[PDB]
Write a protein that binds this DNA or RNA. Structure first.
Ligand SMILES: Nc1ncnc2c1ncn2[C@@H]1O[C@H](COP(=O)(O)OP(=O)(O)O)[C@@H](O)[C@H]1O
Ligand code: BEF
Ligand SMILES: [Mg+2]
Lengths: 9, 95, 95, 107, 93, 621, 82, 98
DNA sequence: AATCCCCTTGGCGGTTAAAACGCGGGGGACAGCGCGTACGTGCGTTTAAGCGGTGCTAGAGCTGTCTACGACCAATTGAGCGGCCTCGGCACCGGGATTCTCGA
DNA sequence: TCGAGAATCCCGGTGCCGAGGCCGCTCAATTGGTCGTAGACAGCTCTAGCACCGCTTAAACGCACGTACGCGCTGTCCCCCGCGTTTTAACCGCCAAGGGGATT
């Protein structure tokens, strides 16, 4: 799920 | 003697006369292990003959042990057993 | 260039310290299979079997070279010669 | 019925009952087969016969009709395979083979 | 007290080999010691052969393999041949 | 010491529950299987009581008490993983919470492009995403796997990550272990992006390596990054001592799929490296087996699986099972394995991010082998199907490729004549013809042709030019290369056999195309010069590349048609080879053309390759 | 009583005879003490095991069979005494 | 002029005579006294049957003859005809006895 | 445990065979010197070992039956063992001839 | 290449003591039963031994050169051998004690 939040910064 | 390995560029070799596979640098390494400082040029044939005799003596006994047990593969217990039969018991795989 | 004899002690100590094999594995394995082929055809070998064979052969050759060195120093020499090897074997009893 | 020794049946001269008893009482194994005493008696007979033949020849060489330990020593130490088999044996009253080195002769 | 030895058997073998050759007492004792030593050697080799294969019964096979191990060269060949012949004759009748 | 082991009540209950509810396959997992013994468990189903359970087991003839011990181990071993599961998911959870609160703020921990990097060059957005991922996963003191697909810039990402470390006051020597054909490029990149880093290329012969060792242990110069190969880090015990007694912070490993085997000597030799952290770069983390990925996970996170390796390898040693033959617990372990690796392994896919890269095509060319090759193939198949002799597969693909890979046109008669006639040569005046014939027996027809061309007295025995170009693959390849030359294309041509590449050289010489060639025989030093020569000179048309060497990590943005003259049993060698050209910076729609022989083992290998590819496509989603 | 100095009972001419039977043609004057030492070592080693066997059989007499067993155990089997 | 033999010839004659014969080359009483001395040290008041001493004498003579053959070989190796203590020590070292 | 007789320990004396002591001399050990050749080292070239990877299948290794073989017992008996003669094979002596060493 | 002398072999005669044959009597080997378990055999699993390939790299090899050591020749001196003379102590023959291993 970290890849998802990476663009969600 | 053959194609003269140098310059022929084969993919696979016939690979005969394997006693020469005990190269003289290896024999020198063994002698220097043994404390020998300088080696004559005729030691190499003598050492190859000695090694061949010793190997035949051990392998005959190992194959005898293997044949008795109805097997087709020479195990390591067989080699240890043939060595122990020679008064040269080897430790590392059993006793 | 250095004198022949410093390398002597260097390699003697390096080889006496290490218990690693001084012969290349594939040539010795080919030789072992060649020798054993003359006793029973279509034979197989465990890897640890040929490993034990090689270790025993190396130890035997080292001991023989030590005895050869003693017999050479007896004749007031530093070079070992085939006569030294045959003398060592004949006093030991192999001949 | 009529008793026949196992040695007579196997065509031997060495006993098979005595060899079998020695095999049993030696604690070599818990059970002893039926051909082990016969095979062992045959092997012993062969070895005895060969050494006796060689020793008889060696005794004939010295113009004697009897065998003494010297002739056994000569027979064993002249044959290569018997020398290998009995390399680590001291035959009593046997002596030594006559053999002088090359350089010890006068020059 | 009774004592057992192979004097008579070696004497019969000798008379089969050389019909006009005797043997002294010392050579007789040497032959007795020889036969006992060979018996002990072969029996010990066969016993350890049995113990190796986790068996508990010495048979013709262990004796044959011990003979092959101990006797060098042609001696092993002839000993194995004559032993097999003796076993075959014993079993056949 | 050996003592009486008392069954604890909790283990009694666990064993009873497992034996009550395990499946037939699960019951098989218990050691001392004797599958009738596992079957008797179903019959012995009262499960009356633990003592009653022992009563039933002992009363059923054909069972052993040690089974209760054996399952006792199994559950315990499984319990070993369970706590690790509990440790692992929280390791995920402790991670997966902190990854969330950064989105709450208007601006979060977006680690921008370091000032150390080349200002004229800029990171791409997904590379920045990966950089942030690496930085944060380091901040919790873990090791990851950067499993980005082939060509996304993993090298650039690693170099920028190291530059970020150097910005944060971490100048510790950090290693890099690279494949042999790639090392030059690495030394090129670490400069062009991050010249501030002091780089030591610890490579070369034992003499040069010993010189480098003497200089560094002299503290002659301070170094931040040491770049080495896979062999030069392991070859000598001196090198192993050097890398153990240094203090290293990051051990980055390019192409980590070389560490797929847990028993390969390089593997444990590489765990001997002293290092606070390690990082793995790979484009294909899972190749053909889950135990391979498990070995990678053990390597990257050793301490948390170090003592439990024996459990993992055995439970993942079920490679022989099929998809449905997998027990329910095995499928559960596969899913929870994906849930164990999800914090460690990051993957991005080019078609999903790099919209500017043109897509890829394929052309499976079925090659009708000619009459002579067809007769030879059928004859050799008939000879082998009857029957040592590993020839069942390899020397069947050899006739699939080219008839000249064996010896058919040089009968023993010609060999005897040549052996007796070459006595006229000076180098073999003393030679023994009876052994020359023995040597010439094991030599193939093309090798014999090369020999004939080499010596003057036997120049009579050259093969005609038509015979050496008699192949279905050659026949289709000539037309394809002519078509692509007219189209103004550049071709990268692969083959798995060195002798096949040698014959390809002759064929290209016949069609007078200019070409380069790289295989494992080429010296390491000038491989980069060859690559640059192809990338700059636009008159070189064909680039022959052996799959093992010329396939790993080089940049071939110049060409736009990749031909596979022969495909691999393992499709990932092919995938790496195809994505050599299809990477960042490419400007043409990269075509991939596979050559396939009609009606041979080649079709079966193609089918198995497609099945494995579809298995990956399913497991990755 | 007291027994002493019988290692000199292995005289010099007896050593020369043993050497002649072994093929030796010329003998240095220092061989004699060396050979006496070697012989005493051998005899002590063999007698140790012979008396070990005798004590294992719990007898006050050492027999020829104990000597034969001791020699055989040392790889020096002696034929002709049992 | 008294007839003396050249030095060495009588030594070869003795070699031949003593390699042809098979009797014991050491006196009985001194050897018995020696074995009794060596046995006194291990335990007191032992008793020896005659064949025990005879077997010990046979074994000792065989041992010494074999050792002297090996010593002769070691002496011939060093291009000498005289046997020296160093020859015996070399033989006993090679055989492993010391 | 009591007892026995047979073998080992110890003793006397003599004789005479072997060992100890002495001495010249010769021949071999041993140190030195000098040539010359063969072994060690250095350098470039190649060549194969070693490692990884893929696949296949013989054969080791284990279990379960049950058939035969080997152990244990009883009674029978005749082969070997100890004993006691008895004669010839061999150790020994004595004379003649032969052969080997050595100094003219 | 030779005469003399010392060692050696050959032949014949002698007698003595141990190999060899005959005999009575155990007592171990043989023969016939029964019983228990050891291993021969069939079958099955899966493991590891072997065959093939490529890559890489270090070791093996071929050659040049030089110098250290092995072997031959020389001289000397010292130590061992052959022969002679003297002492001494082994060896044999006969006799007594007693204790220790075997038998009851
Ligand atoms: N940030 C970037 N900007 C431009 N080009 C890049 C960037 N990163 C990589 N490339 C291109 O990709 C190539 C390097 O790819 P590489 O990182 O070796 O792929 P992999 O990650 O499979 O090893 C270089 O030749 C370069 O041209
Ligand atoms: F791993 Be790079 F994409 F060749
Ligand atoms: Mg890369």
């Amino acid at each position: 799920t970290l890849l998802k939040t990476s663009m969600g910064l | 003697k053959g194609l003269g390995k140098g310059g022929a560029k084969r993919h696979r070799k016939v690979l005969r006369d394997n006693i020469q596979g005990i190269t003289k640098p290896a024999i020198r390494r063994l002698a220097r292990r043994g404390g020998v400082k300088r080696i004559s040029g005729l030691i190499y044939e003598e050492t190859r003959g000695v090694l061949k005799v010793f190997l035949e003596n051990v392998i005959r006994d190992a194959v005898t042990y293997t044949e008795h047990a109805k097997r087709k593969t020479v195990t390591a217990m067989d080699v240890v057993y043939a060595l122990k039969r020679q008064g040269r018991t080897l430790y590392g795989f059993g006793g | 260039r250095y004198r022949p004899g410093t390398v002597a002690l260097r390699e003697i100590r390096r080889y006496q310290k290490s218990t690693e094999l001084l012969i290349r594995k594939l040539p010795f394995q080919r030789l072992v299979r060649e020798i054993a082929q003359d006793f029973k055809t279509d034979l197989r070998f465990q890897s640890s079997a040929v490993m034990a064979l090689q270790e025993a052969s190396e130890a035997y050759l080292v001991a023989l070279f030590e005895d050869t060195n003693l017999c050479a120093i007896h004749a007031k020499r530093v070079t070992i010669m085939p006569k030294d090897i045959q003398l060592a074997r004949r006093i030991r009893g192999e001949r | 019925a009529k008793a026949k020794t196992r040695s007579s049946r196997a065509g031997l001269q060495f006993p098979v009952g005595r060899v079998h008893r020695l095999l049993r009482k030696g604690n070599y194994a818990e059970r002893v087969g039926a051909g082990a005493p016969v095979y062992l008696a045959a092997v012993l007979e062969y070895l005895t016969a060969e050494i006796l033949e060689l020793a008889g020849n060696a005794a004939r060489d010295n113009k004697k009709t009897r065998i003494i330990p010297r002739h056994l020593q000569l027979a064993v130490r002249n044959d290569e395979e018997l020398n290998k088999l009995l390399g680590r044996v001291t035959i009593a009253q046997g002596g030594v083979l006559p053999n002088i080195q090359s350089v010890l002769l006068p020059k | 007290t009774r004592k057992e030895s192979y004097a008579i058997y070696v004497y019969k073998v000798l008379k089969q080999v050389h019909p006009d050759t005797g043997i002294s007492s010392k050579a007789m004792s040497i032959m007795n010691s020889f036969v006992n030593d060979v018996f002990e050697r072969i029996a010990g080799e066969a016993s350890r052969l049995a113990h190796y294969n986790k068996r508990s019964t010495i048979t013709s096979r262990e004796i044959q393999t011990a003979v092959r191990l101990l006797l060098p060269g042609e001696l092993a060949k002839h000993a194995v041949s004559e032993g097999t012949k003796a076993v075959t004759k014993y079993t056949s009748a | 010491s050996s003592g009486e082991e008392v069954m604890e009540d909790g283990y009694k209950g666990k064993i009873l529950h497992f034996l009550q509810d395990a499946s037939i396959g699960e019951l098989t997992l218990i050691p001392q299987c004797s599958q009738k013994k596992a079957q008797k468990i179903t019959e012995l189903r009262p499960f009356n009581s633990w003592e009653a359970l022992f009563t039933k087991m002992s009363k059923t003839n054909g069972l052993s008490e040690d089974l209760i011990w054996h399952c006792k181990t199994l559950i315990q071993e499984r319990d070993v993983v369970i706590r690790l599961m509990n440790k692992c998911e929280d390791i995920s959870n402790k991670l997966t919470k902190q990854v969330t609160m950064l989105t709450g703020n208007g601006g979060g921990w977006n680690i921008e492009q370091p000032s150390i990097l080349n200002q004229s060059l800029s990171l791409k957005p997904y590379q920045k995403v990966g950089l942030n991922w690496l930085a944060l996963v380091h901040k919790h003191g873990l090791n990851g796997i950067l499993a980005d697909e082939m060509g996304l810039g993993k090298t650039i990402q690693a170099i920028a990550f190291l530059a970020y470390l150097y910005q944060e006051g971490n100048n510790g020597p950090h290693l890099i272990v690279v494949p042999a054909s790639t090392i030059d490029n690495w030394l090129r990149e670490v400069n062009l992006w991050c010249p501030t880093l002091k780089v030591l290329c610890y490579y070369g012969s034992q003499e040069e390596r010993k010189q480098i060792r003497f200089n560094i242990h002299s503290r002659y110069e301070d170094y931040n990054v040491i770049v080495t190969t896979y062999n030069c880090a392991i070859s000598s015990s001196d090198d192993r001592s050097l890398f153990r007694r240094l203090k290293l912070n990051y051990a980055i490993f390019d192409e980590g799929h070389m560490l797929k085997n847990m028993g390969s000597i390089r593997y444990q030799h590489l765990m001997t490296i002293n290092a606070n952290n390690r990082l793995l770069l790979t484009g294909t983390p899972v190749q053909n087996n889950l135990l391979e990925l498990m070995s990678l996970l053990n390597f990257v996170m050793p301490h948390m699986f170090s003592s439990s390796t024996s459990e993992i390898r055995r439970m993942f040693s079920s490679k022989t099972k099929s998809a449905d033959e997998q027990s329910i617990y095995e499928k559960e372990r596969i899913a929870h394995a994906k849930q164990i690796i999800k914090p460690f392994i990051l993957r991005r896919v080019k078609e999903e991010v790099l919209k500017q890269l043109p897509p890829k095509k394929d052309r499976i060319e079925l090659c009708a082998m000619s009459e002579k090759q067809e007769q030879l193939y059928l004859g050799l198949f008939n000879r082998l199907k009857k029957s040592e002799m590993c020839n069942v597969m390899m020397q069947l693909r050899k006739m699939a490729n080219h008839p000249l890979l064996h010896r058919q046109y040089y009968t023993a008669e010609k060999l005897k004549e040549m052996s007796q006639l070459m006595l006229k040569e000076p180098t073999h005046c003393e030679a023994n013809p009876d052994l020359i014939f023995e040597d010439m027996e094991v030599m193939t027809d093309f090798e014999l042709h090369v020999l004939c061309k080499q010596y003057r007295h036997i120049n009579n025995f050259q093969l005609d030019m038509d015979l050496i170009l008699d192949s279905g693959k050659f026949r289709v390849l000539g037309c394809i290369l002519s078509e692509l030359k007219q189209k103004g294309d550049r071709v990268v041509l692969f083959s798995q056999f060195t002798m096949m590449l040698d014959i390809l050289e002759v064929l290209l010489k016949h069609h007078q195309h200019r070409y380069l060639r790289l295989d494992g025989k080429t010296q390491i030093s000038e491989r980069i010069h060859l690559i640059d020569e192809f990338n700059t000179d636009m008159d070189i048309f064909v680039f022959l590349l052996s799959t093992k060497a010329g396939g790993l990590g080089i940049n071939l943005t110049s060409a736009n048609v990749v031909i596979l003259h022969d495909i691999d049993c393992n499709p990932y060698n092919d995938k790496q080879a195809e994505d050599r050209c299809h990477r960042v910076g490419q400007t043409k729609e990269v075509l991939v053309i596979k050559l396939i022989s009609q009606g041979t083992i080649e079709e079966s290998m193609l089918k198995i390759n497609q099945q494995k590819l579809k298995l990956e496509q399913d497991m990755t989603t």
